[PDB]
Write a protein that binds this ligand. Structure first.
Ligand SMILES: Nc1ncnc2c1ncn2[C@@H]1O[C@H](COP(=O)(O)OP(=O)(O)O)[C@@H](O)[C@H]1O
Ligand SMILES: Nc1ncnc2c1ncn2[C@@H]1O[C@H](COP(=O)(O)OP(=O)(O)O)[C@@H](O)[C@H]1O
Ligand SMILES: Nc1ncnc2c1ncn2[C@@H]1O[C@H](COP(=O)(O)OP(=O)(O)O)[C@@H](O)[C@H]1O
Ligand SMILES: [Mg+2]
Ligand SMILES: [Mg+2]
Ligand SMILES: [Mg+2]
Lengths: 48, 40, 548, 520, 546
């Protein structure tokens, strides 16, 4: 559940990481690795 | 809940719980916080 | 226009005081206020009745199915509902039986009175209607009575008495609960057949001590009594026969103290040397005196000193604490001893007789037992009641009080005078009271008619709580009484009643073979006090309250 | 009429709960299922424990229904039925508390769908109360009349689901000797009183034929006394051995000054006369509930006489039964015959605390072991585990009944109930079969904590009861199912009877309730 | 349930974190909490409810479509059942109360399978093989639509949709009304495919006599008031022409660009006249066409009303867009957005006008309605509902609107099946024998799926305040023999259900209750797709608003 009330289901790990509002800065680097994993190949976000 | 105040133990809202894997990580990291004091 | 004058001349009384007249449908509201808690009682009437969690101010909880017990804890605002509380409280104190009948009948008399007041009947005629119905109701209860006990002590007759009483409160299994009471009633009664003496029975004789653990099947009937005490000096199984003696003292077993400034005074060293051993000697003397009489257990009334205890356990005299008045008086009735506050020699005639005093583990704590034998019987026996939940111990204990209260009903009147139960006694009065309305003329006939309609709640309640449809079970039962007494004698249509479990249609297979009956003395005062509950509520046309 | 408002009269107080419904009772069941969920994973040896900290910051670690439920102030009225049966099961038997609570819960869940259908309440209670009568009789047939082979095996199973189960090879050897000291028909629980010792390791414990009590006070002449007596003699006292008021009062008039010296010397004369009577009988060990002054302990310290005080009455009663003496609250009536004796005496350092050891008596009624451990919960868990195991081997001596553990009792009883229900009507049928599969919750969760799949287990139990007549149950070692008689796992039947009776009484109590009133 | 979990222990999230079987239990209680209000509204024995908006306004509603839409729930797991109730109202239009109860029990009964260490992927697979096996069994047990010499079907279909309503007792009178209404408003499209537009009939909120004396209009009824009071109210005679206009007829300015700037003040009055004259030239040619009745979407100024009052023309302002398409479709006219043609000239042709037999304005309890009857080209229909107040008629409006959707489906698809929980009880006997064939772990999933389907006939008996197990046991006995029927009709013990008014098991074909099979198909898939959405969730991440 997002801040604006928009509810969304997501099993892919990349889209899960965007909606998670993580306060720690180093933990937010996993958001962009899944974007690079999503942009290059488009599969295995979770694995990475 | 069904609208009624569903309370079991006294001071329901004050105390918390913790289970699963997150309960274990609180235990091991708490030992590492004390171990860093003793290791040096 | 923006605001009313807000009831002028209202400063005659305080702002918190309020008046409530008969107009504005307020008598209908008082009937509706009764209807709030009356519907709670319907789900609690009969063997399939459901208990109630009535938590209270303290937190102390009681789970129950009795009308008089549950209403004690609830703080009530409406005064007309408090009439039912004190009416049921009167029922519990005097007879100890039929409190739900008082609540459910007097509430329904106010229910059918809702129709009568709405029709236009004056309140004065309503009281005259039920009073004339009451005189005919109490008259016919003596006429349709069948059966009698005629014997104070019998194994099979007590099953007809106790079993229909405790069947309402914590039914469970029938035999294991009924045998505990019928065995204990025979112990305490002074039988004394062929002597012409007056019988006597006390409600406080039979008392139940609650012990956690175990199961209901492991409950036993103790001849004597029990406390959760610990012997001070030593414990003894007392395997020695040739029965011991008992001496009861209400004062503390100790050196004498006066009352006004008991202080030592020693002028010289000669008194200092003898003051310490003087005591030993004196106490020892009194104690030896007590013992040459062959006593081996003394029940103390207050705190016992250590020096007196040293000489008691020397000769193996058991010590028991009873720090209260009633706990000390109940024990004398078992052995039949006469206490004396003096520290001298007990009289031999006053010494009690107890064979054995055992100490065993029942509930994990130390308890002392005083089981007698078949020879030299005693009274004021107890019942060891074992159970898992403390709340269930409370309601089963009050069921024994209701059963013991039912045994009181045999002593005062001439006999038992049992009636048919299971709604048969209520449904029979409907036809008799309905015929009585046809014989009397006047505008009071509708009051007599609605008085009969109010008695339908007992079969309607037992049919609703039994999981059956009341629209089919009730008129099927009317067919047994719509075939009224033909020319043949010994008609057996009076024993027809409702049934909780079993055959369809429901006319029970008699209440006979079933061995369930009701007491006449319960029905007399119940209909009397229930009519008084409806009389005082209907006779008043204005109510005044304060602060709310 | 006296006011323009005319307030409507409420029946109950403001804040007094109103409760009518087909539900209402469902909340009480869900409240019990909530408490039942906390005690759910604590079943069996492969379970877990529960850590609770109350408002006073008192740490506790326990797996017992009782302790856990208690360390919890339950305010819900229907949920305290589980608290009562746990204390009732803990007070009498002392084992399988949890089991009783999980049974209750499942009976309640089955009761829930049935109540979601009109099936009423007296009908559900009649099924369990009629079925539990056959379960008690069936357990009597499952149990054996064993008399051959002359305790050891019953203690290993009672120690399960907690700390000392893995150390059962050492604790069961000495725990069986604890109850053998107790004779028949007495079974005093206070003689098995064991104390706390913060510090040490549990492996270094040992068996003691007597008592070991803390002095709790440092006297002026304590070190002067010898710590080792070859032939000690114990004498229990109750008189207060110090210079003070004699009998609850203090008032002494003296006129002449010459007698003022004599009355003081008389007090010094009688106090040594009180001590000399203790010295003349040869009592080497002196014990008293009341305090002992510095004057007395130094008089005893010169001529090699040990003394101690500041002990409770429960400790004093354990001293008499260990040495076999008696209590004497007067020094003049002391005789040689009432003095207790033992083999030897030695005061040893135990966790920075001194304890007076007695051991080697020919006939000792007492077993008291020192519980040493790291944390205060370790010594507490070793106490509760032994207190639960000692009750089992205690009542095993009262009667010799043995049934198969590992959830084997529930399956054999459930099969006959399915046969008994296959013979009866409709309403009752569904109810008895619902009671049957609800009774199988004990082997259900016992294998879920082990990590095994429940379907393969539960399908193997039902179809294999023909050759597994009665001793058929689960085995955790080989990861298979076989006969429990060869594995030497035993358990008494009294836990099973009281569990079903308490569980049947618990579920039937609130099943006869459809209301909830809460004043204030 | 017991206590709140730790808030982001070494995780560093701004919101809340929860995991394990606790949230799975909260979803079960969440689906059961919203399903309890739907329980008592199921079946003819169910009772209605009322929702208060904290402003005095209230509305009585039985169906769970708009009840759950009004109940603003914040838990997102409950929103799927809220949207499921709205989804089922769009496609099928009936059974919104059943999918919420079926979807909640499938999650409730599957909650026991979660703690058995059965994965949800295996559970839904066992549910899905049970689904397609159930759809084929539903496709086998369906019956034809003839059943006799006469129709004898559409009157019985209305009783199922009309049950559990305030006017369920009057369903015998309204059964003839709904079948006569939808057979009048049929159309033709896709070269032979017949369609039945729902909501095309006009449901008027009238007050008066009773729901029993509700007169069926043989034609469309327009709900609008007359412009002027001096106009003729009743227009008799055959071949009444209907004109449907939408252009702006009141005086309006020239377009945005045009700014009249004048230098010679002599023509300042003339430009004012032609702006007033150019709007009357349009009204002049309509009078030349001879249109007795004219309808306009926009307003009508007083400059135009004088010509209609003089020439005895019925001008009505404040019409809506969706209504005039049905007027032109029924009366045979065509929608005129503007008056023009391919040529440069501007004129009006008589072919644009419709035809009807009679037009009468009627007033009943402050509700003026223009009754247009006798359309020559194509028939139309409207239903004038009558009751206590507007809020009671909203239940009747939803009752009629759901009835049109059910009668729509039985004509589009002739296959039907009996009510009373017949197919719900028949699938249990079919799936129990199939559950043993598959062998491995899916037996419990298929078995518990079948046990959840029995909740529909059980709820009929619970709400009836009668003994439920006896009716379920008797319904179980007859359906148990249906699979073992031993064919050689004498294939009896099928097509039976509960009769709640008498409490017996009788034949639903003779009782006169049916339901289309397509409603059972879409309800089962939409209920299972909602069950798949809730079971697959493991951990929640609620982010607080910034
Ligand atoms: N097993 C039974 N079968 C038929 N009737 C019963 C049965 N048990 C009790 N009853 C009837 O239900 C009534 C309940 O009386 P009640 O007012 O509950 O007694 P109490 O004063 O002990 O509460 C009794 O008068 C009796 O006739
Ligand atoms: N060695 C064992 N092998 C198999 N099962 C056991 C063993 N020991 C105990 N159990 C099982 O564990 C269950 C619970 O016993 P226990 O752990 O002693 O008490 P609690 O009920 O408090 O957990 C019993 O039902 C018993 O069948
Ligand atoms: N007269 C009846 N007899 C038996 N069952 C009925 C009857 N009417 C309706 N039902 C049952 O009620 C269920 C749902 O009814 P429905 O008309 O959808 O209620 P709602 O209009 O509230 O949605 C159907 O599955 C049907 O089996
Ligand atoms: Mg009674
Ligand atoms: Mg245990
Ligand atoms: Mg419908």
């Amino acid at each position: 559940k997002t801040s604006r009330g928009e509810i969304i289901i997501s099993n892919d790990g990349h889209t899960i990481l965007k909606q998670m509002a993580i306060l720690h800065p180093v933990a937010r680097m996993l958001v962009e690795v899944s974007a690079a994993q999503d942009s290059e190949a488009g599969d295995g976000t979770t694995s990475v | 809940e069904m609208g009624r105040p569903f309370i079991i133990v006294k001071d329901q809202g004050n105390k918390k719980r913790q289970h699963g894997l997150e309960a274990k990580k609180s235990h091991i990291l708490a030992a590492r916080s004390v171990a860093s004091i003793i290791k040096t | 226009s923006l605001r009313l004058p807000q009831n002028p001349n209202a400063g005659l009384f305080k702002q918190g005081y309020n008046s409530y007249s008969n107009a504005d449908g307020q008598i209908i509201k008082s009937i509706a206020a009764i209807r709030e808690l009356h519907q709670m009682c319907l789900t609690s009437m009969g063997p399939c009745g459901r208990n109630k969690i009535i938590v209270n101010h303290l937190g102390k909880i009681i789970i129950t199915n009795d009308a008089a017990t549950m209403l004690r804890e609830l703080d009530i605002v409406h005064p007309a509902v408090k009439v039912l509380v004190m009416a049921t409280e009167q029922q519990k104190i005097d007879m100890g039986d039929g409190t739900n009948l008082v609540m459910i009948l007097a509430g329904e008399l106010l229910n059918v009175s809702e129709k009568l007041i709405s029709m236009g009947l004056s309140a004065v005629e309503i009281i005259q209607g039920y009073n004339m119905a009451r005189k005919f109701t109490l008259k016919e209860l003596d006429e349709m009575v069948v059966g009698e006990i005629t014997d104070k002590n019998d194994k099979n007759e007590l099953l007809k008495m106790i079993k229909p009483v405790i069947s309402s409160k914590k039914y469970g299994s029938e035999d294991i609960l009924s045998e505990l009471v019928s065995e204990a009633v025979s112990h305490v009664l002074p039988v004394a057949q062929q002597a012409g003496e007056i019988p006597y029975f006390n409600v406080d004789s039979i008392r139940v001590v609650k012990i956690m653990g175990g199961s209901l099947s492991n409950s036993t009937v103790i001849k004597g009594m029990v406390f959760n005490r610990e012997p001070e000096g030593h414990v003894k199984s007392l395997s020695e026969d040739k029965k011991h003696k008992v001496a009861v003292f209400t004062c503390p077993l100790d050196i004498a103290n006066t009352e006004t400034k008991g202080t030592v005074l020693l002028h010289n060293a000669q008194e200092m040397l003898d003051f310490s051993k003087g005591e030993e000697k004196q106490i020892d003397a009194m104690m030896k005196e007590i013992a040459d009489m062959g006593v081996e257990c003394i029940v103390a009334g207050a705190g016992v000193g250590e020096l007196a205890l040293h000489y008691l356990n020397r000769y193996g005299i058991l010590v028991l604490k009873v720090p209260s008045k009633f706990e000390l008086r109940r024990l004398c009735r078992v052995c039949g001893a006469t206490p004396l506050p003096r520290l001298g020699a007990p009289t031999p005639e006053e010494l009690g007789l107890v064979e054995t005093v055992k100490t065993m583990e029942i509930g994990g704590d130390r308890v002392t037992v005083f089981k007698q034998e078949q020879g030299e019987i005693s009274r004021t026996s107890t019942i060891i009641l074992r159970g898992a939940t403390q709340n269930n111990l409370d309601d089963i204990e009050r069921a024994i009080d209701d059963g013991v209260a039912a045994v009181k009903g045999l002593m005062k009147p001439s006999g038992g005078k049992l009636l048919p139960g299971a709604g048969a006694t209520e449904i029979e009065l409907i036809s008799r009271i309905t015929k009585y309305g046809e014989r009397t003329p006047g505008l009071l006939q509708l009051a007599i008619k609605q008085f009969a309609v109010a008695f339908e709640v007992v079969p309607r309640t037992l049919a609703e709580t039994a999981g059956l449809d009341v629209n089919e079970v009730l008129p099927n039962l009317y067919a047994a009484h719509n075939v009224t007494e033909p020319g043949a004698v010994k008609t057996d249509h009076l024993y027809k009643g409702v049934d909780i479990d079993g055959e369809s249609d429901e006319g029970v297979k008699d209440i006979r073979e079933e061995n369930i009956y009701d007491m006449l003395a319960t029905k007399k005062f119940a209909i009397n006090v229930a009519t008084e509950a409806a009389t005082t509520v209907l006779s008043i046309d204005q109510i005044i309250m304060a602060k709310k | 009429n006296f006011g323009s408002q005319t307030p409507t009269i409420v029946v109950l107080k403001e804040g007094t709960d109103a409760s009518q419904g087909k539900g209402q009772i469902i909340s009480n069941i869900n409240a019990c299922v909530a408490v039942q969920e906390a005690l759910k994973p604590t079943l069996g040896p492969l379970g877990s424990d529960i850590l609770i900290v109350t408002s006073n910051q008192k740490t506790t670690i326990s797996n017992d229904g009782a302790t856990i439920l208690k360390l919890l102030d339950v305010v819900h009225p229907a949920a305290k039925t589980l608290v009562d049966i746990s204390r009732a099961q803990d007070a009498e038997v002392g084992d399988g508390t949890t089991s009783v609570t999980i049974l209750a819960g499942e009976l309640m869940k089955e009761a829930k769908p049935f109540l979601e259908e009109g099936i009423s309440s007296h009908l559900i209670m009649k099924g369990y109360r009629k079925a539990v009568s056959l379960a008690v009789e069936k357990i009597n047939e499952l149990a054996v009349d064993i008399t051959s082979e002359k305790l050891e095996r019953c203690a290993r199973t009672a120690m399960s689901s907690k700390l000392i189960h893995n150390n059962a090879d050492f604790f069961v050897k000495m725990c069986v000797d604890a109850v053998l000291s107790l004779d028949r028909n007495d079974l005093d629980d206070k003689l098995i009183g064991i104390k706390k010792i913060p510090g040490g390791a549990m492996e270094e414990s040992l068996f003691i034929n007597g008592v070991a009590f803390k002095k709790t006070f440092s006297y002026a002449g304590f070190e002067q006394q010898p710590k080792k007596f070859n032939n000690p003699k114990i004498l229990s006292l109750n008189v207060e051995l110090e210079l003070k008021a004699e009998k609850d009062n203090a008032e002494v008039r003296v006129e002449h000054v010459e007698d003022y010296q004599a009355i003081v010397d008389a007090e010094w004369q009688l106090i040594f006369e009180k001590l000399r009577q203790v010295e003349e009988t040869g009592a080497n060990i002196v014990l008293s509930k009341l305090p002992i002054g510095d004057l007395a302990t130094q008089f005893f310290a010169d001529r090699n006489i040990f003394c101690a005080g500041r002990v409770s009455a429960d400790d004093m009663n354990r001293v008499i039964q260990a040495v076999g003496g008696s209590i004497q609250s007067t020094t003049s009536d002391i005789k040689p015959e009432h003095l207790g004796t033992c083999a030897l005496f030695e005061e040893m350092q135990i966790g920075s605390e001194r304890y007076n050891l007695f051991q080697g008596c020919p006939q000792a009624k007492t077993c008291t072991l020192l519980l040493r451990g790291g944390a205060e919960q370790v010594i507490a868990e070793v106490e509760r585990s032994l207190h639960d195991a000692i009750m089992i081997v205690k009542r095993a001596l009262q009667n010799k009944l043995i049934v198969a553990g590992g959830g084997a009792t529930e399956m054999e009883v459930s099969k006959c109930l399915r046969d008994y229900s296959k013979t009866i009507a409709g309403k009752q049928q569904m109810i008895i079969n619902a009671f049957a599969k609800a009774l199988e919750v004990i082997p259900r969760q016992l294998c879920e904590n082990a990590g095994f799949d429940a379907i393969e287990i539960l399908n193997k139990l039902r179809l294999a009861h023909s050759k597994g007549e009665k001793w058929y149950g689960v085995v955790f070692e080989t990861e298979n199912i076989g006969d429990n008689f060869a594995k030497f796992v035993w358990e008494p039947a009294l836990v099973k009877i009281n569990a079903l009776n308490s569980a049947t009484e618990a579920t039937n109590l609130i099943l006869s309730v459809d209301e909830t009133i809460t004043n204030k | 349930q017991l206590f709140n979990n730790s808030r982001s222990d070494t995780l560093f999230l701004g919101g809340e974190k929860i995991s394990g079987d606790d949230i799975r239990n909260q979803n079960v209680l969440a689906t059961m909490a919203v399903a309890n209000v739907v329980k008592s509204s199921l079946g003819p024995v169910g009772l209605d409810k009322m929702l208060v908006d904290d402003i005095g306004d209230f509305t009585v509603t039985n169906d769970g479509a708009t009840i759950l839409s009004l109940l603003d729930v914040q838990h997102p797991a409950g929103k799927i059942l809220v949207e499921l109730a709205q989804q089922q109202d769009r496609e099928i239009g009936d059974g919104t109360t059943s999918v919420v109860i079926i979807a909640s029990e499938l999650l409730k009964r599957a909650n026991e399978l979660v703690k058995n260490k059965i994965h949800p992927t295996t559970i839904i697979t066992g549910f899905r093989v049970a689904l397609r096996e159930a759809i084929r069994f539903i496709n086998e047990v369906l019956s034809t639509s003839v059943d006799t010499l006469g129709k004898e079907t559409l009157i019985n279909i209305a009783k199922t949709s009309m049950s559990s309503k305030i006017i369920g007792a009057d369903s015998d009178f309204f059964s003839n009304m709904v079948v006569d209404a939808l057979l009048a408003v049929k159309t033709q499209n896709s070269k032979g495919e017949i369609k039945y537009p729902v909501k095309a009939v006009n449901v008027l909120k009238a007050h008066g006599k009773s729901a029993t004396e509700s007169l069926l209009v043989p034609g469309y009824a327009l709900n609008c008031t007359v412009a002027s009071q001096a106009m003729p109210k009743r227009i008799a005679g055959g071949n009444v022409k209907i004109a449907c206009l939408d252009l702006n007829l009141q005086k309006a300015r020239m377009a945005m660009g045009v700014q009249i700037n004048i230098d010679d003040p002599e023509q300042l009055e003339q430009i004012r006249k032609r702006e007033a004259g150019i709007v009357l030239e349009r009204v002049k040619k309509i009078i030349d066409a001879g249109a007795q009745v004219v309808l306009t979407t926009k307003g009508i100024d007083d400059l135009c009303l004088k010509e209609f009052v003089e020439a005895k023309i019925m001008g009505v302002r404040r019409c809506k867009k969706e209504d005039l398409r049905r007027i032109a479709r029924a009366t045979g006219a065509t929608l005129v957005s503007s008056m023009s043609n391919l040529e440069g000239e501007e004129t009006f042709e008589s072919s644009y006008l419709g035809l009807c037999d009679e037009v009468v304005q009627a007033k009943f309890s402050d509700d003026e309605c223009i009754l247009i009857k006798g359309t020559s080209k194509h028939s139309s229909s409207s239903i004038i509902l009558r009751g206590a107040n507007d809020y009671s008629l909203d239940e009747m409006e939803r009752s009629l609107h759901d009835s049109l959707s059910v009668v729509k489906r039985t004509l589009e698809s002739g296959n039907v099946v009996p009510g009373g929980g017949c197919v719900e009880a028949a699938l249990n006997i079919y799936l129990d024998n199939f559950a043993t064939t598959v062998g491995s772990r899916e037996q419990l999933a298929i078995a518990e799926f079948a046990a959840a389907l029995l909740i529909i006939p059980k709820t009929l008996a619970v709400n009836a305040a009668k003994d439920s197990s006896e009716l379920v046991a008797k319904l179980r006995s007859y359906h148990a023999a249906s699979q073992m029927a031993k064919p050689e009709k004498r294939r009896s013990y099928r097509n039976y259900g509960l009769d709640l008014i008498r409490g017996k098991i009788v034949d639903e074909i003779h009782a006169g209750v049916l339901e289309p099979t397509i409603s059972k198909v879409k309800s089962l898939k939409s209920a299972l797709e909602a069950c798949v959405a809730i079971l697959r969730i493991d951990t929640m991440i609620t982010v607080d608003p910034e």
